[PDB]
Ligand binder design. Structure first.
Ligand SMILES: CC(=O)Nc1cccc(N)c1
Ligand SMILES: CC(=O)Nc1cccc(N)c1
Ligand SMILES: CC(=O)Nc1cccc(N)c1
Ligand SMILES: CC(=O)Nc1cccc(N)c1
Ligand code: NA
Length: 164
């Protein structure tokens, strides 16, 4: 079946808990595989130790820039960037897992978890999974955001990997 992966998240060095994500490999195998491998760190790099650097309440929590930690960086397991696989899955509501980008065909490692339905992102960002468990943790992360996206606490993925 589809991979189940996890992110364990701290805020200012205290654990918030675990976000569990289903990766929809049946719809977007290439995008799912990238995220899976970045969680396990099996290629020698990935999400462990990186941050949620941009969080906007009533919108989304963004993470995955493990090179620059500011939204300019990251890399995929294939190379620096890879194409938009498809736009079949939609930004249907809270819990949607989707690829951040800098325009068409610029997927790297950066990703976001929606806290609302973000329909205007349909056809522009590749949706590749959803939150199975831990929306409470996502809501905590969301609460440390701001209109600008600047976080009021340091939000760190302390551990991550694959459950199945
Ligand atoms: C049961 C189920 O699939 N729930 C679901 C589906 C798509 C997106 C989100 N956030 C939650
Ligand atoms: C400058 C740059 O590459 N920015 C950027 C922003 C969001 C996601 C990705 N992959 C890249
Ligand atoms: C981050 C962002 O704005 N991305 C994006 C992706 C596809 C088309 C357009 N116009 C913009
Ligand atoms: C197309 C567009 O506006 N994309 C976008 C902008 C800010 C944050 C996120 N997640 C996606
Ligand atoms: Na599974």
């Amino acid at each position: 079946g589809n991979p189940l992966v996890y992110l364990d998240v701290d805020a200012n060095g205290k654990p918030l808990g675990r976000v569990v994500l289903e990766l929809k490999a049946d719809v977007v195998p290439k995008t799912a595989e990238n995220f899976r491998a970045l969680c396990t760190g099996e290629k020698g790099f990935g999400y462990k130790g990186s941050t949620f650097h941009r969080v906007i309440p009533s919108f989304m929590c963004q993470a995955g820039d493990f090179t620059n930690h500011n939204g300019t960086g990251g890399k995929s397991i294939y190379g620096s960037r890879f194409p938009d696989e498809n736009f079949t899955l939609k930004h249907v509501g809270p819990g949607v897992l989707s690829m951040a980008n800098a325009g068409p065909n610029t997927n790297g490692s950066q990703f976001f978890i929606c806290t609302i339905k973000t329909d205007w992102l349909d056809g522009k960002h590749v949706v590749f999974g959803h939150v199975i468990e831990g929306m409470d943790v996502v809501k905590k992360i969301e609460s440390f955001g701001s209109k600008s996206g600047r976080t009021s606490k340091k939000i760190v993925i302390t551990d991550c990997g694959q459950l199945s």
